[PDB]
Design a protein around this ligand. Structure first.
Ligand SMILES: [Mg+2]
Ligand SMILES: [Mg+2]
Ligand SMILES: [Mg+2]
Lengths: 242, 121, 145, 527
RNA sequence: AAACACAAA
RNA sequence: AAUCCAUGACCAAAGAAUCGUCACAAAUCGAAGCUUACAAAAUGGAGUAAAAUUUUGUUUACUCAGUAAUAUGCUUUGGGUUGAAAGUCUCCCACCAAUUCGUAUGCGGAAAACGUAAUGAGAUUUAAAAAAAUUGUUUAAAUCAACUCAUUAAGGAGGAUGCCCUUGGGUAUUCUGCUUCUUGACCUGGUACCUCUAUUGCAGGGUACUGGUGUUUUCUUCGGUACUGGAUUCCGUUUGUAUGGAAUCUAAACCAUAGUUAUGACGAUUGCUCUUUCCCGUGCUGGAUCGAGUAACCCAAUGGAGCUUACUAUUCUUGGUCCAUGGAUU
């Protein structure tokens, strides 16, 4: 079975309310995903590290899969999961995870500075670490922190969707994915589809060939994409429940 | 008392045996589906119309399950018939120290109900 | 000796990109809305030229030179949008990545390419295509109820 | 009931008030008229049987049948439908009346054990084409007929045919008028012009004066599950031709015969039987020399190295460092001596030590060195002075299984068991059978229940708990992939003491070159 | 491609 | 002349193995298998709990096969298979007390342009190689090695010689000589007997005998018998044979512990060859680091055997031989 865990939600902050058109486009994208052939879907929601987290428990997730996607879950026959990434820049206005880890399932981070990489490798209870594949990677990915974050259990996420947007950022995406493949030594590499429109969706064969031509062996691709994604989902569920 | 049971008399000429699956108690479900699909594809080359699915005893439940699968999954007409099967059992009758297997064998009849399940193309 | 061939089966799927209209969530409904039809401006030389352009645009010069040695479209009809691309066993990954990186037709936009089956002979490809066509009819018959 | 059976023969020898018997092998004994007893078996052991019979012939008459009586085997469901299509009757008889209905049964296991049909048949060269019998009452075949078959039986004609085949006078009178192919050709050419000019007959009628009556016997076997048919030596060829003429009949060989015997549950005499004398002798010899020739034929760097195989047994000892037994043959002498040493270790102390002109053996390495020294001494002279493994299935029920410094005097009983693989693995011949230890007993149980991946499929890519060395309790003689069930069937022989030792039926299997341990469960076989 | 022939080369 | 060391030439053997992984109620680059239908619960099973019924009987609510089966899963192997898959080489893949290679002929073998053994000879001056297949070189031509052709029928007994041995016995060679027995090259003529064509002379066939090369110049196949896929129906039968006669419709015979342009993708482990290192005992398919390489011919299309021809130079290896040369001692 396949696992897609990088579907973005059309909402960046808490203040902006979502519209019906965005929900319709997300439904189109998820239906296209299920049409191409998938089993697990985990939509992602982006938020900033400086934005004020609300002091609530029943309002942390502006998704509400049960009332919105619960009917599609029963009809088309798939499941949905909640995932949130942390766009961290500076160690200020933070120091809170025991409340954001229980509501959502998977907790990710997005470091954009050299101090962000240290803060992610040292003092974040996260499962996946992702970079801005569209623009330039912050300073330099080294084996020093990557090895120490992979030996504990944190994997590196690669967004193959960011390449399908424009023509110019393809060069930066390739230069970053080859760098992270060379640094990670090809053990903890998870793949995700960061597309919000149904016109940027692909199948397993094409993505496998792309990641293979980018520098990943054939066994690593399948083994990771399946087992590591399933294990990340299971670890997230265990963190939410017990 | 020691008693052994032999199979039931099967008199099939040349083609009743081909387009017929005998569902055992240890036969898996997916293997039965595969064999039924192969039989359904090979029937019109054998020259018949339907596929016989015979099971008796413990396998009757999963035989009916196999039937109900193709009932709505492939939308194929099924026919269920209830028949009787006579089996001969060798029993030992009391009449020095000999082998348990080498004793007086007497044949006894036993009737059991079974289900034949035909599937069309 | 034998020339090692490897045929590639691909499908053209049109995502129903229309946010103003509400849609039905089911199996056969989305199968029909994704397998609607191919436009009239669809042929073999128009898809081959597009894939040849995309190959040079993504891989480069040598990447197109090594791949364009035995790159041919053997069987394709616009009624079902099913095509069989012949290539080497060495350059199968290249052709698959190019079919994945297919953006759009020069005049028709909003479409994706899905590689389904890859094999080294046309008989197994035809058998798998027949099996897929037979499987498609089942959900249709079930939903027509 | 004069039914044919397949038992285990023995070599009895009494000189003066003493009786010592040795395991001989198989045999087929059949009784007729309570006096005429026929015994059929392997020629190599038939010589010794004939010898030990002729040595005691003061009140008994012996008759050899090696070139005057022949038998051929039929196997399958439609085997009797072709044998009937070939055979015909000269005179009315109830034997044929029953055989006609039996030919339509199509199931051999439905028929009872007692089934012997004998009569006088026509020469198969007489028939032109193998015409099938009347098939009109095929639908009206119930169990009442099989019930009545056990009651209705013409014993008189059966005994008459048996006495005709046994007596050498009627057997020679059968060769009175053996017509030639030219004779039958001329008779068929002159049958063209007969008195009834309305029906075309391509056959020739039988004559009670100028024609030979041929005695034939048909018997069914329960163990082998086949139909044997006995016919004189010179009469087998015409029957064999018309039998092979049936376009659903192929010729089965000794290799395929061994395959069929191994498939169900059964055993072959020279290849499988490890406890008889001549069978085990020739097995050890031929297999060891053939494997050694194939091994020394290949050069270094081209054959599997049994000498250098790491991590085979946990806490490796510096005695062999490679294979524990013989690199080529499944040697039971080493197993016997090793188990005797382990039993002596348990008799000297409750625990056993591994590492540290008879020496005070205190470790397993001392027993391994004794085994190697015995083999080094055997390098030149003959082996199997007494025996290595007997079989005592009935003796344990009779009295008991009962457990100086020899380590090679008393042998160790084995039982014929069939171990089947329940998980990923492929067995081969000359395989090693180990017993599951006590510490990692739940791991194998969980693996046999199920251990899947988060993806959903099974998961066996883990670290295996390599067991110790003193746990080998058997050797697989017939290792072949079972095609009737879809798994790997292993035919081995385990120790009865180790069988009663374990509280479970779980047993590990290993190859001779492979360092992986598969799991399975064994079932007893009474052969 | 393979495989075939009292061919053909 | 003996031994050792190094090179070169030639003959012979083999073609390392083990584990894990790859979405779709079906899949894969592919393949096969998990079908002699039952848990003695069908001689109209075994019992418990409540109501009513004067016990039976009846209506409700449960237990027992438990080593229990577990839903497109599960196990296995796949291009040298007891080395060449390569090759315009040969042969088997119905039988025939016999116009049918009735061939007891050195041995083995069903056959084979098949393997091998002892002796003698030979080189377009020869039985035949130079001015059917195969192969880049394509046997030899001081000696050896290799090719070709010509002889040697199986078993038992006696004598002589040679060896261990000196009652005696065992092995090898050579001479005399017996046993191994299916009234058969083919074909023509004459005579004698029997049967059919329903009297005979005569016409044809068979058998027993004698005589003869007799135009057997078609010096390459020319004899006899045999419906081998499946379904159903009709008719006769203790007067005779215990089974026989005929009819309709379809096209299948579909089969590989690789099977029909397939035999994939990488990861990990041991072992094999050399080189730069340290230790016990010299040494030891003695052990551990720094490194390089895992070959080539080449690839199935129905199965088996024989032969020939391609391979192994830092483009893996192994064993032996050499009246081949090179160095050293006696
Ligand atoms: Mg070929
Ligand atoms: Mg060819
Ligand atoms: Mg060929």
């Amino acid at each position: 079975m396949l696992v897609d865990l990088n579907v973005p939600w059309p909402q960046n902050s808490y203040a902006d309310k979502v519209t019906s058109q965005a929900v319709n486009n997300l439904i189109k994208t998820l239906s296209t995903l299920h049409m191409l052939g998938y089993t697990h879907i985990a939509i992602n929601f982006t938020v900033n590290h400086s934005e004020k987290f609300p002091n609530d428990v029943k309002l942390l997730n502006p998704i509400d899969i049960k009332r919105r996607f619960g009917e599609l879950m029963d009809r088309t026959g798939l499941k949905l999961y909640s995932r949130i990434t942390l766009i961290i820049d500076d160690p200020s206005k933070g120091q809170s995870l025991s409340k954001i880890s229980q509501a959502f399932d998977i907790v990710a981070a997005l470091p954009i500075s050299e101090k962000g990489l240290t803060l992610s490798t040292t003092n974040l209870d996260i499962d996946l670490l992702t970079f801005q594949y569209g623009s330039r990677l912050p300073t330099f990915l080294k084996h020093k922190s990557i090895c120490s974050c992979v030996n504990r259990g944190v994997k590196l996420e690669i967004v193959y969707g960011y390449a399908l947007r424009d023509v110019q950022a393809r060069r930066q995406f390739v230069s970053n994915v080859r760098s992270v493949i060379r640094s990670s030594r090809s053990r903890g590499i998870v793949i995700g589809s960061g597309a919000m429109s149904p016109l940027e969706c692909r199948n397993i064969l094409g993505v496998t060939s792309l990641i293979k031509n980018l520098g990943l062996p054939s066994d690593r691709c399948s083994k990771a994409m399946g087992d590591l994604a399933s294990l990340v989902l299971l670890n997230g569920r265990l963190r939410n429940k017990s | 008392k020691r008693v052994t049971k032999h199979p039931s008399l099967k008199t099939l000429t040349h083609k009743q045996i081909h387009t017929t699956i005998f569902v055992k108690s240890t036969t898996p479900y997916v293997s039965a589906l595969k064999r039924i699909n192969k039989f359904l594809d090979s029937v019109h080359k054998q020259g018949s119309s339907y596929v016989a699915v015979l099971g008796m005893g413990k396998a009757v439940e999963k035989t009916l399950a196999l039937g109900c699968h193709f009932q709505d999954q492939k939308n194929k007409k099924i026919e269920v018939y209830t028949k009787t099967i006579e089996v001969l059992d060798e029993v030992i009758t009391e009449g020095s120290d000999v082998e348990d297997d080498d004793k007086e064998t007497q044949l006894k009849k036993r009737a059991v109900s079974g289900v034949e399940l035909r599937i069309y193309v | 000796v034998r020339l090692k061939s490897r045929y590639i089966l691909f499908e053209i799927i049109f995502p129903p990109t229309d946010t103003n209209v509400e849609e039905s969530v089911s199996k056969a409904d989305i199968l029909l809305s994704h397998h609607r039809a191919s436009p009239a401006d669809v042929s073999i030389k128009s898809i081959l030229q597009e894939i040849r352009r995309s190959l040079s645009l993504n891989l480069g010069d040598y990447g197109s030179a090594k791949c364009n040695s035995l790159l041919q479209l053997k069987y394709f009809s616009n009624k079902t949008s099913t095509g069989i691309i012949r290539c080497h066993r060495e350059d199968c990954d290249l052709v698959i990545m190019a079919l994945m990186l297919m953006s759009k037709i020069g005049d028709v936009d909003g479409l994706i390419v899905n590689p389904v089956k890859v094999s080294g002979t046309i008989k197994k490809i035809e058998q798998f295509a027949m099996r897929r066509n037979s499987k498609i009819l089942n959900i249709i018959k079930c939903s027509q109820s | 009931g004069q039914v044919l059976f397949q038992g285990l023969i023995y070599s009895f020898n009494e000189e003066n008030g003493e009786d010592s018997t040795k395991p001989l092998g198989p045999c087929d004994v059949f009784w007729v008229q309570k006096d005429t007893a026929i015994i059929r078996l392997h020629p190599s052991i038939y010589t010794q049987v004939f010898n030990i019979l002729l040595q005691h012939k003061e009140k008994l008459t012996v008759q050899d049948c090696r070139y005057s009586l022949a038998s051929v085997t039929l196997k399958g469901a439609k085997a009797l439908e072709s044998l009937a299509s070939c055979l015909r009757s000269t005179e009315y008889s109830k034997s044929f009346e029953q055989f006609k209905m039996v030919s339509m049964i199509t199931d051999h296991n439905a028929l009872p054990q007692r089934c012997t049909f004998a009569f006088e048949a026509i020469d198969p060269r007489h028939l032109a084409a193998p015409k099938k019998l009347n098939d009109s009452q095929r639908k009206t075949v119930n169990s009442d007929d099989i019930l009545s078959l056990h009651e209705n039986y013409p014993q008189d004609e059966i005994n008459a045919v048996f006495n005709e085949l046994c007596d050498p006078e009627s057997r020679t009178q059968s060769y009175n008028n053996q017509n030639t192919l030219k004779e039958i050709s001329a008779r068929r050419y002159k049958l063209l012009t007969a008195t009834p000019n309305s029906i075309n007959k391509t056959t020739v009628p039988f004559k009670e004066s100028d024609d030979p009556s041929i005695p034939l016997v048909i018997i069914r076997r329960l163990k082998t599950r086949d139909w044997i048919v006995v016919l004189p030596w010179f009469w087998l060829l015409p029957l064999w031709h018309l039998l092979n003429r049936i376009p659903r009949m192929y010729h089965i060989g000794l290799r395929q015969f061994q395959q069929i015997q191994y498939e169900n549950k059964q055993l072959y005499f020279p290849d499988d039987y490890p406890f008889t004398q001549l069978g085990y002798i020739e097995n050890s010899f031929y297999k060891k020399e053939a494997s050694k020739t194939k091994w020394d034929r290949k050069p270094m760097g081209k054959r599997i190295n049994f000498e250098k195989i790491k991590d085979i047994h946990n806490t490796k000892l510096p005695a062999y460092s490679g294979e524990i037994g013989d690199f080529f043959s499944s040697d039971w002498r080493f197993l016997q001596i090793l188990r005797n040493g382990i039993d002596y270790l348990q008799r000297n102390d409750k625990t056993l030590e591994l590492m540290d002109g008879v020496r005070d053996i205190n470790c397993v390495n001392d027993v391994l060195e004794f085994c190697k020294d015995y083999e080094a001494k055997t390098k030149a002279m003959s082996l199997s002075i007494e025996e290595n493994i007997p079989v005592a299935l009935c003796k344990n029920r009779k009295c008991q299984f009962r457990t100086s410094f020899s380590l090679t005097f008393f042998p160790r009983c084995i039982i014929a068991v069939s171990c089947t693989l329940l998980e990923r693995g492929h067995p081969k011949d000359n395989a090693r059978i180990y017993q599951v230890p006590e510490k990692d007993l739940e791991h194998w149980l969980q693996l046999a229940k199920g251990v899947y991946r988060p993806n959903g499929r099974k998961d066996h890519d883990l670290k295996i708990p390599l067991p110790e060395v003193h746990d080998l309790i058997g050797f697989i003689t017939s290792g072949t992939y079972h095609l009737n069930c879809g798994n790997g069937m292993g035919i081995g022989f385990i120790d009865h003491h180790a069988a009663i030792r374990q509280p479970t039926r779980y047993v590990l299997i290993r190859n001779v070159g492979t360092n992986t341990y598969r799991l399975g469960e064994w079932s007893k076989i009474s052969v």
